[PDB]
Motif scaffolding. Structure first.
Motif, mmCIF file in Angstrom:
data_model
loop_
_atom_site.group_PDB
_atom_site.id
_atom_site.type_symbol
_atom_site.label_atom_id
_atom_site.label_comp_id
_atom_site.label_asym_id
_atom_site.label_seq_id
_atom_site.Cartn_x
_atom_site.Cartn_y
_atom_site.Cartn_z
ATOM 1 N N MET A 18 108.809 51.510 119.501
ATOM 2 C CA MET A 18 109.019 51.416 121.000
ATOM 3 C C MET A 18 110.237 52.306 121.468
ATOM 4 O O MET A 18 110.065 52.812 122.522
ATOM 5 N N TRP A 62 113.486 49.169 128.228
ATOM 6 C CA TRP A 62 112.698 49.597 129.233
ATOM 7 C C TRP A 62 113.328 49.674 130.575
ATOM 8 O O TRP A 62 112.699 50.729 131.477
ATOM 9 N N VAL A 86 102.080 43.106 124.613
ATOM 10 C CA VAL A 86 103.007 42.537 125.806
ATOM 11 C C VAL A 86 102.265 41.358 126.693
ATOM 12 O O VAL A 86 103.129 40.466 126.837
ATOM 13 N N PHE A 144 113.127 44.308 127.297
ATOM 14 C CA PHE A 144 113.051 44.450 128.676
ATOM 15 C C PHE A 144 114.217 45.304 129.358
ATOM 16 O O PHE A 144 114.231 45.836 130.243
ATOM 17 N N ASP A 180 101.545 44.532 134.360
ATOM 18 C CA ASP A 180 102.585 44.081 135.448
ATOM 19 C C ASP A 180 101.815 43.079 136.181
ATOM 20 O O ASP A 180 102.451 41.983 136.350
ATOM 21 N N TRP A 222 99.522 50.577 133.218
ATOM 22 C CA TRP A 222 100.862 49.782 132.893
ATOM 23 C C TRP A 222 101.029 48.962 134.216
ATOM 24 O O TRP A 222 101.826 47.829 134.250
ATOM 25 N N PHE A 262 100.198 55.326 134.246
ATOM 26 C CA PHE A 262 100.995 54.468 134.787
ATOM 27 C C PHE A 262 100.468 53.403 135.654
ATOM 28 O O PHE A 262 100.924 52.475 135.948
ATOM 29 N N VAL A 303 108.164 58.942 126.844
ATOM 30 C CA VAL A 303 108.154 58.758 128.476
ATOM 31 C C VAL A 303 109.061 59.567 129.095
ATOM 32 O O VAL A 303 108.808 60.066 130.090
ATOM 33 N N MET A 350 112.228 40.396 123.099
ATOM 34 C CA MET A 350 111.736 40.377 124.552
ATOM 35 C C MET A 350 113.012 40.927 125.419
ATOM 36 O O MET A 350 112.680 41.740 126.472
ATOM 37 N N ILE A 407 100.862 39.953 134.180
ATOM 38 C CA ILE A 407 101.915 39.180 133.493
ATOM 39 C C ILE A 407 102.556 38.077 135.049
ATOM 40 O O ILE A 407 102.901 37.354 134.595
HETATM 41 C C1 LIG Z 1 106.202 54.237 133.152
HETATM 42 O O1 LIG Z 1 105.404 53.205 132.440
HETATM 43 C C2 LIG Z 1 105.165 53.458 131.251
HETATM 44 C C3 LIG Z 1 104.420 54.535 130.728
HETATM 45 C C4 LIG Z 1 103.853 54.612 129.488
HETATM 46 C C5 LIG Z 1 104.075 53.574 128.612
HETATM 47 C C6 LIG Z 1 105.042 52.499 129.165
HETATM 48 C C7 LIG Z 1 105.192 52.437 130.320
HETATM 49 C C8 LIG Z 1 106.018 51.328 130.603
HETATM 50 O O2 LIG Z 1 106.463 51.271 131.699
HETATM 51 C C9 LIG Z 1 106.378 50.171 129.745
HETATM 52 C C10 LIG Z 1 106.990 49.197 130.316
HETATM 53 O O3 LIG Z 1 107.603 49.252 131.200
HETATM 54 C C11 LIG Z 1 107.384 48.139 129.156
HETATM 55 C C12 LIG Z 1 106.936 47.970 128.150
HETATM 56 C C13 LIG Z 1 106.220 49.443 127.584
HETATM 57 O O4 LIG Z 1 106.093 49.554 126.254
HETATM 58 C C14 LIG Z 1 105.934 50.459 128.604
HETATM 59 C C15 LIG Z 1 105.092 51.635 128.185
HETATM 60 O O5 LIG Z 1 104.810 51.801 126.953
HETATM 61 C C16 LIG Z 1 107.192 47.041 126.957
HETATM 62 C C17 LIG Z 1 107.683 45.904 127.555
HETATM 63 O O6 LIG Z 1 106.526 45.045 128.099
HETATM 64 C C18 LIG Z 1 108.466 45.023 126.720
HETATM 65 C C19 LIG Z 1 108.897 43.568 127.002
HETATM 66 O O7 LIG Z 1 108.362 45.504 125.142
HETATM 67 C C20 LIG Z 1 109.067 45.954 128.822
HETATM 68 C C21 LIG Z 1 108.428 47.051 130.005
HETATM 69 O O8 LIG Z 1 107.723 46.369 130.794
HETATM 70 C C22 LIG Z 1 108.653 45.642 131.774
HETATM 71 C C23 LIG Z 1 108.049 45.513 133.077
HETATM 72 C C24 LIG Z 1 106.966 44.021 132.873
HETATM 73 N N1 LIG Z 1 106.099 43.661 134.079
HETATM 74 C C25 LIG Z 1 107.707 43.094 132.363
HETATM 75 O O9 LIG Z 1 108.796 42.672 133.158
HETATM 76 C C26 LIG Z 1 108.510 43.528 131.000
HETATM 77 C C27 LIG Z 1 108.947 42.471 130.156
HETATM 78 O O10 LIG Z 1 109.300 44.492 131.297
#
Ligand SMILES: COc1cccc2c1C(=O)c1c(O)c3c(c(O)c1C2=O)C[C@@](O)(C(C)=O)C[C@@H]3O[C@H]1C[C@H](N)[C@H](O)[C@H](C)O1
Lengths: 101, 105
Positions: free
Chosen positions: A6, B89, B11, B86, A89, A85, A82, A13, B82, A92
């Motif tokens: 991650m 990210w 996720v 969160f 959103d 993802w 985008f 990104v 998580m 969830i």
């Molecule tokens: C420009 O967006 C992306 C473009 C390419 C890959 C990505 C993303 C991306 O934004 C992205 C995420 O925003 C999130 C994750 C992710 O891997 C990516 C991409 O890979 C992982 C995540 O879900 C967790 C908890 O591990 C957290 C996060 O989500 C955010 C927003 C969710 N609605 C939720 O609140 C989560 C817990 O946090």
């Protein structure tokens, strides 16, 4: 600390959004990123070269005189990603709402 | 891309378990509704994912109670990841916002 698979996903990104701002060379990218991160994010050259060779292989970026640029394929994939993802959103958010009610 | 489909699938499943312990059938149904029919996960995909998550200590299982169903739960380690995930990210989003702003100035 954050998982490593991650961490790379996060770094990919960020690098792509840099190239989205405009073509750039490795030194400018690490510099821009360090500043934009208020010093907290220090990328290493070999991590970028490892990452940039893969993006170039996948046709996501190209190079020239060494500058890197986001190809039209790259711009397209960033949109799909985008949007994907974005669907996540809402899924969830639907899960939370459905839980309450 | 497959790695992005599976990352997203992880996720989603993890957030379901964040909402509460649940059994596989209940999870697939909840996700099907939440995605308005767009994401119909099959049993075997969850078993593949749950084996790795349970191995890494991110979830555990136990028997709940007419009839009996195997429920899965997000461990305390899983809740922590998580949180870390969160937050990291979230900072990424800010870094990118800074990159545009800094670009003009
Ligand atoms: C420009 O967006 C992306 C473009 C390419 C890959 C990505 C993303 C991306 O934004 C992205 C995420 O925003 C999130 C994750 C992710 O891997 C990516 C991409 O890979 C992982 C995540 O879900 C967790 C908890 O591990 C957290 C996060 O989500 C955010 C927003 C969710 N609605 C939720 O609140 C989560 C817990 O946090």
């Amino acid at each position: 600390e954050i998982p490593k698979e991650m961490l790379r996903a996060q770094t990919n990104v960020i690098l792509l959004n840099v190239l989205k701002q405009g073509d750039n060379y490795v030194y400018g990218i690490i510099k821009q990123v360090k500043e934009a991160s208020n010093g907290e994010m220090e990328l290493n050259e070999a991590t970028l070269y490892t990452i940039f060779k893969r993006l170039e292989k996948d046709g996501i970026i190209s190079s020239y005189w060494k500058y890197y640029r986001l190809t039209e394929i790259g711009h397209e994939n960033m949109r799909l990603a985008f949007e994907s993802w974005s669907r996540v959103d809402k899924i969830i958010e639907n899960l939370e709402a459905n839980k309450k009610s």
